[PDB]
Amino acid sequence: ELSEAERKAVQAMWARLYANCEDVGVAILVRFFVNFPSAKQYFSQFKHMEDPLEMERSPQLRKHACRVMGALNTVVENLHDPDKVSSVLALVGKAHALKHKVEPVYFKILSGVILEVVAEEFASDFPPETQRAWAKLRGLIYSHVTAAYKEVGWVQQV
Numbered sequence: 001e002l003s004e005a006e007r008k009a010v011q012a013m014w015a016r017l018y019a020n021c022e023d024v025g026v027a028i029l030v031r032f033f034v035n036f037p038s039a040k041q042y043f044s045q046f047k048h049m050e051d052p053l054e055m056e057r058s059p060q061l062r063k064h065a066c067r068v069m070g071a072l073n074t075v076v077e078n079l080h081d082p083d084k085v086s087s088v089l090a091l092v093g094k095a096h097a098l099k100h101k102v103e104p105v106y107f108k109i110l111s112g113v114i115l116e117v118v119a120e121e122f123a124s125d126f127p128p129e130t131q132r133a134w135a136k137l138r139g140l141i142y143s144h145v146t147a148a149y150k151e152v153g154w155v156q157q158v
C-alpha cells in the first residue's frame, strides 16, 4: 500500500503528468465519456454533447478536468500523510454521493481510465514494481471514496 519507493515513483510520474494538468485531464474525461456515455448524464452541460470534439475543447469540461486533476494532485502529493489523503477523498466522496449523486462504481471506472493514460505517457518506462504501485493508488482511492458513500448510507434514487 505504497512504500516509500512506490510513493516516489508514482509521485514523479504524476508530477510530469500534472505539469500537463490541462490536456491530460481533458483527455481522461473525454475518454471516460466515450467509453461510458452515461456518466455524461450527471453533467448538465455535457449530458448532450456527443461529439468528443465539442468536449475536447470546452472551457467547462476543461474546468472539471482542472478540479479532478487538482484533487488527485493533493492526494498524490500528501500520499505520506494518511490523514490528508483520507480527508481529501472523504470530502470528495461525500460531495459526489450527496450533492452530485454519482453512483460510486464510476470512480473505479474513471480511475482505470486515468491509469490508462499514465501508462501511455510512460509506455517507455512503465516497470512492474511501478505499474503495481499505481494499482494501489487506484484501489486506495476507490475504497476511501466508497467508505464515504457507505458512511452516508448511500442509495441512488429513481
Ligand code: HEM
Pocket: 039, 040, 042, 043, 044, 064, 067, 068, 069, 071, 072, 092, 095, 096, 099, 100, 102, 106, 107, 110, 111
Ligand atoms: C477521480 C475522482 C474524482 C474527483 C477528484 C472529482 C472531483 C470533483 C471536484 C473537485 C468537483 C468540484 C466540485 C465539488 O468538489 O463539489 C467535482 C464535481 C463533479 N463531479 Fe467529480 N470528481 C471525481 C470523479 C467523478 C466521477 C467518476 C463522476 C461521475 C460521472 C463525477 C461527477 C461530478 C459531477 C456531476 C460534478 C458536478 C459537476 C458540475 O455539475 O459542475 N466526478 N468533482
